[PDB]
Amino acid sequence: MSQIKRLLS
Amino acid sequence: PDMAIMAVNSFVKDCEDPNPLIRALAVRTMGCIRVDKITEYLCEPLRKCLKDEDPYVRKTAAVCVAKLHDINAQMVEDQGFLDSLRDLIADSNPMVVANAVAALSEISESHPNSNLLDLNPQNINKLLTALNECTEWGQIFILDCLSNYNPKDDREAQSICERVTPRLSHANSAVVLSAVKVLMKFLELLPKDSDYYNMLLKKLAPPLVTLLSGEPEVQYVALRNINLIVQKRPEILKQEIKVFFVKYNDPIYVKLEKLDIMIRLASQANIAQVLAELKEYATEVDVDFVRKAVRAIGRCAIKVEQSAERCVSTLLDLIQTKVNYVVQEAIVVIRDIFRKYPNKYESIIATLCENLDSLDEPDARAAMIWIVGEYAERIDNADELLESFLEGFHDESTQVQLTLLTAIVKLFLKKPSETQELVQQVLSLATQDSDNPDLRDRGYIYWRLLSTDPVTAKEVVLSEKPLISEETDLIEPTLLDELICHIGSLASVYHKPPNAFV
Amino acid sequence: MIGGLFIYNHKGEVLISRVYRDDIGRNAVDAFRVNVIHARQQVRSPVTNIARTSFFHVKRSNIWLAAVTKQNVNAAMVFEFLYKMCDVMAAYFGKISEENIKNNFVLIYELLDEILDFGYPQNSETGALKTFITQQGIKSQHQ
Amino acid sequence: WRREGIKYRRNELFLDVLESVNLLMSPQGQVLSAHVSGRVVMKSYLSGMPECKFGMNDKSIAIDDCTFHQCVRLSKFDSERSISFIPPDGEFELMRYRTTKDIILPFRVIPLVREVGRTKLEVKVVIKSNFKPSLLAQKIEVRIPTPLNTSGVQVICMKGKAKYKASENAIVWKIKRMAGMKESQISAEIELLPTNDKKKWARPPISMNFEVPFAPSGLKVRYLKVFEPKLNYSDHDVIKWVRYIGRSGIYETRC
Amino acid sequence: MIRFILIQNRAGKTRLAKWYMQFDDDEKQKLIEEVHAVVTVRDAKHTNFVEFRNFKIIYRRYAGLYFCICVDVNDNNLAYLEAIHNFVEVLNEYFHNVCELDLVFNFYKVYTVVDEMFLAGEIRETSQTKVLKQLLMLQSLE
Amino acid sequence: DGMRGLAVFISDIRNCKSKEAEIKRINKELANIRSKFKGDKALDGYSKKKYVCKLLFIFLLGHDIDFGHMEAVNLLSSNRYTEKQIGYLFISVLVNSNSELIRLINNAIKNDLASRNPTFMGLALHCIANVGSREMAEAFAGEIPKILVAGDTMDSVKQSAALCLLRLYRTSPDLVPMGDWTSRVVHLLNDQHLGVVTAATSLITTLAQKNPEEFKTSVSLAVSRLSRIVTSASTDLQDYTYYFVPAPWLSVKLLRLLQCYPPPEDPAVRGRLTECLETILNKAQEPPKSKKVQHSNAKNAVLFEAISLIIHHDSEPNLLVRACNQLGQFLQHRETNLRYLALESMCTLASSEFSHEAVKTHIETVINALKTERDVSVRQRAVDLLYAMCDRSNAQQIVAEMLSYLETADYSIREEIVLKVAILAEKYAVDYTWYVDTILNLIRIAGDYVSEEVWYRVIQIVINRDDVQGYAAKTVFEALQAPACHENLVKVGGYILGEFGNLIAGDPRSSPLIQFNLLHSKFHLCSVPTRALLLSTYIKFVNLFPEVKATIQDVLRSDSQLKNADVELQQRAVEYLRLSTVASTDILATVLEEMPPFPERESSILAKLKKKKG
Amino acid sequence: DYQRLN
């Protein structure tokens, strides 16, 4: 769910 | 466990309210969170739920007894609920007495060798009246209790057997097999009388047979049970051999079990058509099945003469295929044929020893090795044959080792001059090198025997043995008896005592 | 009696589960996956034993239904119960598959409570427990 | 199970039909128990994973029990359009079957025992073929069981070669070839010496082995249409040979 | 040495695999399945090191992605744990707020980032600025 | 960058609604690219590139590609970087066997190493390192060292050729001799570009495993580099300074390299190194130069590799002790990562004299960890520790705890745990009453998970030890009385009462008849090998206790025994029957005389533990 | 023997 969410912050 | 404790006050107020259907929710959840702290708040709700105007709350509360027995169960309240569940066995509804029986029976496994002590007619006559009423599953639990019970004399056994005799039952497997368990324990009643024994085995055949028309998994369960029932009393299923012929699309596990039963029910008469079946079974494609077939051909030869020559002929026909696992399974069964029919089939040895180059399975090697032991005198080069395994005596199964030891001294007692160095090598291996205390033992036992008196050694070791006699993969007779007492249950599926699974 | 009822897919993910007893730790579910679901030998039998833990199983299309126990249960009784369970799922949501399981997370566990307390099979039919179980509204008729 | 694209210089196929005819027969000559186990092996060498529809005379009557290879799928919106399948390359066991009715026994064998006191023992066994006179039964063997006390035997046979084996307690009469509706005979004189006079000899049956080039169920292959969508060729392009082989199995008599 | 490097998403899509010793295709598929089944279930309580055959995998979560290195049993667990972060930080500086999709649509680029920082199973470049110097300068050239 | 069309294609696949949509779509693009490659003109470079990248993407998706290898091979010869990049990437992923493409590709690699453009050299080198083919070793394993030394090839190139040569060494060492480069390669430790140090270190490290004398010169240089790294200030090495830590990964690598040798030959070097190590220990005890976790992870990475070097040398006891106490602190630390690593590290300390006693101090926390930890992998390292620190003093309580762990421990480990306890008990046996007990607990607890070798040994010991024979027979007899009873106890107890039941037949509770009748309750319940054992043991009784010979002969004459379908069982039943029947008093009792002591041997228990790491 | 099938 939500491939676009950033890996860091 | 962790979520619930902080509001224990909810589930004590929830078992008390009106509405009889929604009083079991609180009662079943209270017993599933598992703690010491909950025992402070469960004691007095469980007391009041066991006599509820509605059967639903008694059903659930009778289970919560055996729930509580898992957690800190050594109380004067637990001695109070020992009374509270027995009084609930002569209860109006079937769904209440069913659970009472289940809980109480499982609690009897917390055993001081003195738990729910069967009080005979007053205890049992209420079970046998409740057993006619009880729900599908209730009947199971009630019958599984009855299996503990022992009777005194013949009419005691009869008046229980006549009650259960009506069990060509609905719950096709679960009930019927437990009824068989009861009817098969209570089977000592004039070992054959005039009429009751000789009709009880008439009535035991049909519901065993019709178990085979259920699903595959209970086909299997029923067949594992029938395998025992056929050992103990084979008179029950004497002529039903034709039912256990293997149907084409049977699942492998059913095929394998049916095949065993076929061999047990084979006779002087039917053998002709049993072989006809075995020959085709050996052409099938699953390996395990093929093996059990070719094994079973050997088992026929031993079980019935005349089929002797035929069966051996077809076993060699099998060896000539040069399929390794067929040859290995065959050459094993041929050992036991030499044992039932000694000195007749000697000439085969030639053909067998051709193949020994490729026997990887322990059973097969030990079979061959023993064959050279007993027939060393006839085989000129037994010397060199047995000497071949020694090279790697370790890296070889303890089955092979013990047999090789015994076989070599058999040879030495037969050919002592041309043998000295060999027995010394083997008894050295068995004695000094070996780690298996029991191998070492037998090494010494032989070395001591031979070196003390060869005149005696020859008479001890090479004594005329007796013959093996139609046993053909038979179970340990005292173990059989124990397993029969567990008929419906998992030990009957496995053919081991319950004491091999904690 | 029955101390664990587990239901897998063909790949060996766990679709539903229900431990009933202290006897059976959750790693049992791995023990079934490892040793039977993905065994190298597909010619076995229904009941397997592993570390004194006995594993009953029955397939429906690609869904494994499995019973577990450490006790010496009435073996007939466990398969019988798994069959009576597969009878209930049909009248309550039709075909046996992953889709119909994903719909009925709610229904499955509520049936698990009504048919089975502390390992004992209680009682089971579409009528006698109709308003004693709450389902949904619209079913799965596609497939 | 026919994975990747198959490729061959000329697309032909071979059908083998393999049948073992079991039989127990009474000394008078009564078909009292008998069945035929059967199997169809297909050695198909053809290009591109094709479809096949296979057919045969079930319902010209008969067929008890049977099973098919996993490739077969007998149902597509109910019932069957015969056996219908996607054959693997090369040799595989298509189906395996059994049959009991309309049985066609290849040989009939007729004993004549006649004792002279308890000293001598006259024997005459006659065998008759019961198939097409144009056809070629091979590997015929007839095993006539002698008593366990046998002083000596004397034997002569009209066709084949025969000899009494002491070990096997039987006369072994072998015939390399025999055609249909023909007759042959062996006649034998067995000498004795009586010991215990109670164990009165459970007379074993006469056993027979034979290979025949016909299917003793009565089965014959009607057709097997091969179709291939991807490529151009289909069922008139493929060269199709069929073979029937009748193994003995257990073929007893004089019981 | 490093045996392989995986980047998997929660679901099991394997968004990068670098193999540093030549396994079969079936072997690979199974490693990928196994790495997934191990790693995905393990919470923040559990350590980042898990022994596995006689390899051992270091892993670290970022968003729905799993960054796994598989190393010899004698290799330094923490050194590799932070090599993973060193690498992900480059990725974030080269893609600016990097996400899962950035690696899908620039897959052929991600491989070139990986190969600057790891090669022949061992670490190559630790220096974040120097890697970005070789990425940006000498991305330019067609 | 670009990749004309790729974005649109991957968007289409994301936009797919089913497996059938994905597949139909992909076969569409595959048809398109096959139509374009199979003689649809000569495309320009950017065209081949964009299509090969779509094929590559399809392949990496999971669908199988059966072409585009010739096309990628063309792209290798391009002078556009982007064209070679996709090209090389493709062949590095979809690797081909064909003899004409291995050739073409190798000519492509060679003609890139031929340029002095270091970027194209780069792609060739990385290709060799990533596919490592024999045919590439045979081509270039010669040229790769020459590039690494010899001329001024660039720093980036030296990095890649070092790791490339490392791969070639590992794949095909017969093509990496130990020629003249040896010297120049070591000098790379003294390069300004730290990345060349990081790389060359890994090459030397691996070469030194089999050629220590050849790279012996490394040690001095490695040390002086390392001590210069942990001495350097806040603005030094700023490129390679990770989360307020100087060159963590290089420090780790160099410490590793120093473990490829002893402690250093020369006084001055060894001084510098031990000073350097004391510093590394100090910096861990100092306050945290940042809140962020990457600081502690990266700093500790180095601490741990230092401790490894300390334990490798086993020289300086000051360091061994400090190491012990520091790892000690980590046993209670909040991060599981650190606990797991501290337990790991301490196990190798425990097998060293100067440290052994310090390790033991922590035993209570270790035991607490094993009991408390709520992982498994951690608990398991805690047990590995106990075993390792275990000697004489500990054994008492260590074995008690391990035995209690075995109770709840999972099914798969058990076998190993049992094997380990049965070593510790045998090794640290004060009192052989405790040995016999420990083994017999392992049986009632595991038993299933015992092992032949274990129960073989307790009998060997028991018959060899004399004094324990009485105890053995009593304890055994008394434990066979429990109906709960596991089969391996019947094996041990059978053989033991066979030899030493005479030492307990005094007592009316343990008479000959009571002993036999006890064992024969188990006869039908047990397996064949066990029944064969009980038969040896039964005639051993006929010798020992002539009072009981009547009873035992009725059991040996039984139909079940003499007609037993198993051969050993009938052979033994008949041999032992005919001995008791026939023979004489003294010919019996010669045969069944006391049984000599086992000779001194290796432990098959040990050889089996050692077997189980394979 | 092998005969042909249309």
Distances (CA, A) of F148 to B89, B477, E130, F156, F162: 90, 80, 20, 11, 6
Alpha helices of chain D — where are they, by DSSP H?
A: none
| Widest Cα–Cα separation across chain A | 17
Pick E78's closest partner by Cβ from F119, F160, F304.
F304
Residues in contact with F509: Cβ distance below 8 Å, sequence separation at least 6, in sequence order: none
Domain identity same for D238 and D222: yes
Residue (of B312, B234, B309) closest to B267 by Cα position: B234
Strand order in the sheet with D221-227: D83-85, D51-56, D221-227
Domain identity same for D99 and D217: yes
Domain residue ranges in chain F = 1-596
Give the C-alpha separation, B128 to B134, whole Å.
10
Closest chain B residue to C1, measured at CA: B106
Q: Which long-range contacts (CB under 8 A, 24 or more apart) does B205-213 make?
A: B205/B236, B205/B237, B205/B240, B206/B168, B207/B167, B207/B168, B207/B169, B207/B176, B207/B180, B208/B180, B208/B236, B208/B237, B209/B237, B209/B240, B209/B243, B210/B168, B211/B172, B211/B173, B211/B176, B211/B177, B212/B243
Residues in contact with B314: Cβ distance below 8 Å, sequence separation at least 6, in sequence order: B275, B279, B297
**Range of C59's domain?**
1-143
Q: In Å, what resolution does this model reach?
A: 3.4
Beta strands in D5-64 (DSSP E): 12-25, 31-45, 51-56
Other Cβ atoms less than 10 A from the Cβ of B115: the count is 14
Beta strands in chain C (DSSP E): 5-8, 14-18, 48-50, 53-60, 63-69, 116-117, 120-121
Number of domains within chain C: 1
Strand-pair category, D183-191 with D239-247: unpaired
Give the C-alpha separation, B458 to B446, whole Å.
11
Hey, of B441, B449, B462, which one would you mutate to test binding to chain F, going by the most F CBs within 10 A of its CB? B441
Domain identity same for D25 and D135: no
**The tokens of E121 are what?**
């199973």
Tell me the residue type at F408: T
Domain CATH code at residue D127: 2.60.40.1170
Domain identity same for D115 and D200: yes
Contact D121, D192 (CB under 8 A): yes
Domain CATH code at residue C102: 3.30.450.60
For chain F positions 522-551, those within 8 Å of chain B (CB to CB) are: 524-525, 529, 532-533, 536
Beta strands in F103-261 (DSSP E): none
**The tokens of F342 are what?**
């501290």
Domain identity same for D109 and D175: yes
Closest chain G residue to D237, measured at CA: G6
Cβ of D213 within 8 Å of Cβ of G1? The answer is yes
Give binding residues of D as ranges: 161, 165, 174
For chain E positions 71-90, those within 8 Å of chain A (CB to CB) are: 88-89
Closest chain D residue to B307, measured at CA: D204
- F587: which chain B residues are within 8 Å (Cβ-Cβ)? 452-453, 456
Cβ of B479 within 8 Å of Cβ of F578? The answer is no
Chain B nearest-CA distance from C48, in A, is 9
- Do chains D and F touch, with touching meaning 3 or more CB–CB pairs less than 8 Å apart? no
Give the C-alpha separation, F312 to F318, whole Å.
14
Give the C-alpha separation, B42 to B44, whole Å.
6
Give the C-alpha separation, F539 to F556, whole Å.
9
State which approach was used to obtain the coordinates: X-ray
Side-chain-facing half-sphere of E96: CA atoms under 13 Å:
1
**The tokens of F330 are what?**
């980590």
- C49: which chain F residues are within 8 Å (Cβ-Cβ)? none
- Do chains A and C touch, with touching meaning 3 or more CB–CB pairs less than 8 Å apart? no
Residues in contact with C103: Cβ distance below 8 Å, sequence separation at least 6, in sequence order: C93, C136, C140
Domain identity same for D140 and D201: yes
Cβ of F248 within 8 Å of Cβ of E82? The answer is yes
Cβ of C118 within 8 Å of Cβ of B174? The answer is no
Return the number of CB contacts < 8 Å for E and F: 133
| Widest Cα–Cα separation across chain C | 45
Chain D nearest-CA distance from G5, in A, is 6
The whole-angstrom distance between residue D183's C-alpha and the CA centroid of its chain comes to 19
Domain residue ranges in chain B = 1-502
Burial B267-299 (b: 16+ CB within 10 A, else e): eeeebbbbbbbbbbbbebeeeebbbbbbbbbbb
Closest chain E residue to A4, measured at CA: E99
Is F276 annotated in a binding site? The answer is no
Domain identity same for D8 and D94: yes
Give the C-alpha separation, F106 to B494, whole Å.
63
Strand-pair category, D51-56 with D83-85: antiparallel
Other Cβ atoms less than 10 A from the Cβ of D43: the count is 14
Q: What's the residue count for chain B?
A: 502
Is F54 annotated in a binding site? The answer is yes
- A7: which chain E residues are within 8 Å (Cβ-Cβ)? 62-63, 65, 88, 91-92, 98-100
Other Cβ atoms less than 10 A from the Cβ of B241: the count is 19
Cβ of G5 within 8 Å of Cβ of D241? The answer is yes
Angle between helices F487-500 and F512-521 (to 10 degrees): 160
C22 touches chain F (CB under 8 A): no
Question: From the CA atom positions of chain C, what is the Rg in Å?
Answer: 15
Burial (Cβ within 10 Å: 0-12, 13-18, ≥19) of residue F118: middle
Give the C-alpha separation, B23 to B5, whole Å.
19
Partners of B470 in the beta sheet? none
B198 touches chain D (CB under 8 A): no
Pick D24's closest partner by Cβ from B249, B272, B306.
B272
Is F390 annotated in a binding site? The answer is no
Distances (CA, A) of F219 to B108, F189, F270: 74, 10, 10
Residue ranges of domains in chain E, CATH in brackets: 1-142 (3.30.450.60)
HEC-encoded secondary structure of F432-468: HHHHHHHHHHHHHHCCCCCCHHHHHHHHHHHHHHCCH
**Token match 């040859």: residue?**
B327
E72 touches chain F (CB under 8 A): no
Angle between helices C105-115 and C75-93 (to 10 degrees): 140
Residue (of B286, B287, B284, B281) closest to B299 by Cα position: B281
Cβ of B477 within 8 Å of Cβ of F574? The answer is no
Residue (of F129, F214, F127, F122) closest to F165 by Cα position: F129
Burial (Cβ within 10 Å: 0-12, 13-18, ≥19) of residue B173: buried
For chain B positions 278-337, those within 8 Å of chain D (CB to CB) are: 279-280, 283, 285, 306, 309-310
Contact F459, F426 (CB under 8 A): no
- Do chains F and E touch, with touching meaning 3 or more CB–CB pairs less than 8 Å apart? yes
Burial F103-112 (b: 16+ CB within 10 A, else e): ebbbebbeeb
Please tell me which chains touch E, using 3 or more CB pairs under 8 Å as the contact test.
A, F
**The tokens of F487 are what?**
């089969």
Q: What's the residue count for chain E?
A: 142
**The tokens of B497 are what?**
């005592």
Tell me the residue type at B230: V
Alpha helices of B94-164 — where are they, by DSSP H?
A: 94-107, 121-133, 136-146, 154-164
Contact B313, B349 (CB under 8 A): no
- C49: which chain B residues are within 8 Å (Cβ-Cβ)? 494, 501
Cβ of F341 within 8 Å of Cβ of E104? The answer is no
Return the number of CB contacts < 8 Å for B and D: 34
- Do chains B and C touch, with touching meaning 3 or more CB–CB pairs less than 8 Å apart? yes
B33 three-state secondary structure = coil
Is F269 annotated in a binding site? The answer is no
Closest chain E residue to A8, measured at CA: E62
Hey, of C23, C27, C142, which one would you mutate to test binding to chain F, going by the most F CBs within 10 A of its CB? C27
DSSP F365-387: HHHHHHHH-SSSHHHHHHHHHHH
Chain F nearest-CA distance from E124, in A, is 6
Domain F1-596 has CATH 2.40.128.120: no
Cβ of F525 within 8 Å of Cβ of B497? The answer is yes
Domain identity same for D57 and D171: no
Contact F305, E79 (CB under 8 A): yes
Tell which CATH architecture fits domain B1-502: Alpha Horseshoe (1.25)
Closest chain C residue to B101, measured at CA: C120
Q: Which long-range contacts (CB under 8 A, 24 or more apart) does D193-202 make?
A: D193/D149, D193/D151, D194/D118, D194/D149, D195/D149, D201/D147, D201/D148, D202/B306
Distances (CA, A) of E49 to B73, E16, F106: 42, 20, 40
Hey, of A5, A7, A8, A9, which one would you mutate to test binding to chain E, going by the most E CBs within 10 A of its CB? A7
